[PDB]
A paper describes a structure:
Using antigen-specific B cell sorting, we isolated monoclonal antibodies (mAbs) exhibiting neutralizing and non-neutralizing activity, termed mAb HTN-Gn1 and mAb nnHTN-Gn2, respectively. Crystallographic analysis reveals that these mAbs target spatially distinct epitopes at disparate sites of the N-terminal region of the HTNV Gn ectodomain.
To elucidate the epitopes targeted by mAb HTN-Gn1 and mAb nnHTN-Gn2, we crystallized and determined the structure of HTNV Gn in complex with its cognate Fab fragments to 3.5-Å and 2.7-Å resolutions, respectively. Interestingly, the conformation of loopβ4-β5 is distinct from that observed in the previously reported structure of HTNV Gn, where loopβ4-β5 mediates contacts between HTNV Gn tetramers observed in the crystal. Indeed, Fab HTN-Gn1 seems to stabilize loopβ4-β5 in a helical conformation, and there is no evidence for the formation of higher-order Gn oligomers. The epitope of the neutralizing Fab HTN-Gn1 occludes approximately 1,200 Å2 of solvent-accessible surface area and is reinforced by 18 hydrogen bonds and a salt bridge, identified by PDBePISA and LigPlot+ (54). The epitope at loopβ4-β5 contributes approximately 60% of the total buried surface, where the paratope partially wraps around the residues constituting the CDRs in the heavy chain. Although the epitope is predominantly protein specific, CDRH2 also forms minor contacts with the first and second N-acetylglucosamine (GlcNAc) moieties of the N-linked glycan chitobiose core extending from Asn134. The mAb HTNV-Gn1 epitope overlaps with one of these sites, which is targeted by four known neutralizing antibodies: mAbs 3D5, 16E6, and 16D2, which neutralize HTNV, and mAb KL-AN-4E1, which neutralizes ANDV.
Numbering used by the authors:
A (entry chain B): 20 to 34, 37 to 198, 205 to 281, 291 to 372
B (entry chain D): 1 to 216
C (entry chain C): 1 to 221
Write the structure that this text describes.
Amino acid sequence: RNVYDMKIECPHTVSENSVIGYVELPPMPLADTAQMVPESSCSMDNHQSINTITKYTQVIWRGKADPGQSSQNSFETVSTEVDLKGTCVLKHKMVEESYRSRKSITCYDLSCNSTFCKPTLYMIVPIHACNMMKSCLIALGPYRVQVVYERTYCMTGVLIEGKCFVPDQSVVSIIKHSVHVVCFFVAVKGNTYKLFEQVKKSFESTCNDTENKVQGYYICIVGGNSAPIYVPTLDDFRSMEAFTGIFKSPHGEDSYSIVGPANAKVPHSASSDTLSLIAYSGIPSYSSLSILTSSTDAKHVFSPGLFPKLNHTNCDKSAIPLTWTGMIDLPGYYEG
Amino acid sequence: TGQVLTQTPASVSEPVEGTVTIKCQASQSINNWLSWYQQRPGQPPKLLIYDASTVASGVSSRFKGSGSGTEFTLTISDLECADAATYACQSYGYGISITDNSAFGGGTEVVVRGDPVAPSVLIFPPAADQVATGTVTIVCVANKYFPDVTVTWEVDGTTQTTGIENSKTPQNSADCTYNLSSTLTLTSTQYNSHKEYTCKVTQGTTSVVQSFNRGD
Amino acid sequence: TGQSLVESGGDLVKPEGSLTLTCTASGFSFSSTHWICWVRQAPGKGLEWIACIYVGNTYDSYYANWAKGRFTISKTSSTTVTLQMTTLTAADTATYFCARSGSVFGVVSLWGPGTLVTVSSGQPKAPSVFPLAPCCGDTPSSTVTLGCLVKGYLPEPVTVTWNSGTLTNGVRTFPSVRQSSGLYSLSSVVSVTSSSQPVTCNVAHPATNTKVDKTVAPSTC
Ligand SMILES: *[C@@H]1O[C@H](CO)[C@@H](O[C@@H]2O[C@H](CO)[C@@H](O[C@@H]3O[C@H](CO[C@H]4O[C@H](CO[C@H]5O[C@H](CO)[C@@H](O)[C@H](O)[C@@H]5O)[C@@H](O)[C@H](O[C@H]5O[C@H](CO)[C@@H](O)[C@H](O)[C@@H]5O)[C@@H]4O)[C@@H](O)[C@H](O[C@H]4O[C@H](CO)[C@@H](O)[C@H](O)[C@@H]4O)[C@@H]3O)[C@H](O)[C@H]2NC(C)=O)[C@H](O)[C@H]1NC(C)=O
Ligand SMILES: *[C@@H]1O[C@H](CO)[C@@H](O)[C@H](O)[C@H]1NC(C)=O
């Protein structure tokens, strides 16, 4: 029982746009998250690729098994291959195809310590469901979420402190005279997806030999409702601001006790340690999902009870978040 | 799902300087997550092999653990008398698989065959204080012997069948030898009828007979 | 340099009764990266998991499927943990070990000697120590062996020492054996020279708080 709310805001007037909502769920046992997939009953069928199997690397920490050294409260790390379904691992052009196919994208992000997990369920639907506003029920493990459609008193804008807001910055904005954003990492090989070639340019980070590093972009939805924005793109300074916020605060925006640091092997078959993490104890916090930077092929990382190194000063033993939520400042004006 | 751990063989008998093989098979596959423990009687269990291949600090290199997936083996090379103990395997899981595959082995008994030693048999007649209680038991012991023996009780030539208890000492950590105590419990009324009480210890072909007469 | 865990409690309990065990750490700080667990082993059966607790600043515990709801594990201080047992049956009679591990059900880096919980409807009983001496008709020898016989008692654990532990060489103490009436009997013998002073065996039963000191001499028959 005790159903939880998934708020989604819809404008009166519609302008290739999708809306997104999120909800943070209470902690659940880690063992029960295996084979956990969202089961939706909406009129829009969930995308079949989300429920597919994505192979993750499970990195866990435990006190040292060896007696004598265990008396010195030392801990070791174990890397293993696991199969995770329903996680927010989007593919190239999946959002647009879902938009044109009237299909929803329902996935969840996991925030886990060594034993318990806090899931954050996400749903991306086209605005085509904002007129019918048919209520839906989604089941994810022992939790229930209410799909609630809210009609804001804005034609095309987003409500901020009781006022509407439309970000243009275009010539239209000139004539007329903090926004929440959620991002997902999509891995795709190519030549125009040199993510870290732009990271080295944007921030003073000693990252040489970027060719062998991870390739991909970040797709973000600003203000709940907006057209898909790729990150980074050099001709959208809004996307550039999203990029900066992603790499200035990789852990996100807004207890737990930090245990010693550790290193681990992200493929679980590597010759040497390839990732730096911070193990911790306490209530689950931050994101347990990340992607190894030093590998062209996306090496997804699941580290319950550990904090991946997101500082990126040295590109060795580095990682980037799978999902990112925060606030970025963009120019614009309110209606009226 | 219910994970079951099978450990074989239940009992193994190998001589000194030999080798011992213990097989531990898991119903569900475990990615090289196994532990081997040595438990002496009246002693805390000792960890020797963890992660199915790593020797714990302070453990001799003669203990080697191998195996992965669903089948593992433990080998003891250069067998010693102190190695005679009970061994078991533990299947532990991590992260998602906590309590999913968490079980203990059945347990294996390791006896180390050494140079055979004849048993020195001692018999003790019941004490004076014992007969007053109404229940009387007779203690016969066999000391420093190998291998195992069979104990026979005879009263006036007739073999007893009821009221016999045997307690065997674990093998000595120095010479791989046993010590056995045999108790024949009767009633004071029965004990005052017969005269010839005999304790017979048979070690294969060798038999050591120790007897006594009541009132002598 | 001795780091160890010690289990207390574990007396004779009637069926459907309750008993609380306690585990204590010696010379070892508790830290925050450890897990304390309880393992039981019935006579003639393998090791069995019971429960675990994260024993840190935060609270987290895991119980066995069979022991869920019936058992209760909790940490008390920075060196002790407990294990509440309720509605115990005859099948619960086992030796309970205290375990320390780096994970929930993972590798046990250190064990304890263990404590025995005897679940039986019978009443506690005294050992009633009897002396064991050879028949006087035997020809005297250079060396003679003597011993003490411990008859029916309850519960199972008894401690037998000779001359308050001063002499250890030549001492052979045998394991206990259960009789028909559910009572245990233990025998211990010692071999000494005929010129030695009389030897005393010290049988101690902590459950009934009985300490019998029976001394024997080579001249005993
Ligand atoms: C990985 O992360 C997970 C995150 O989930 C973590 O597990 C949680 O960790 C947190 C942090 O420790 C735990 O939170 C604690 O829980 C304690 C136990 O809660 C139970 O007991 C409460 C006390 O019971 C007594 O008091 C009440 C009121 O006086 C009385 O009614 C009872 O009968 C009894 O006498 C009890 O209140 C509580 O009940 C809550 O929940 C039920 C629903 O289950 C609800 O109906 C109740 O109304 C109530 O909301 C529950 O039964 C708790 O004692 C503790 O609080 C202490 O600390 C605070 C702060 O100092 C004090 O103010 C307080 O007085 C206590 O001293 C705290 O709340 C949480 O229980 C864990 N489990 C879960 C599922 O969340 C793992 O440990 C992490 N693992 C790692 C890091 O390895
Ligand atoms: C990363 O490390 C550098 C070290 O110079 C520090 O200045 C910076 O604040 C850290 N964090 C981020 C997000 O760059």
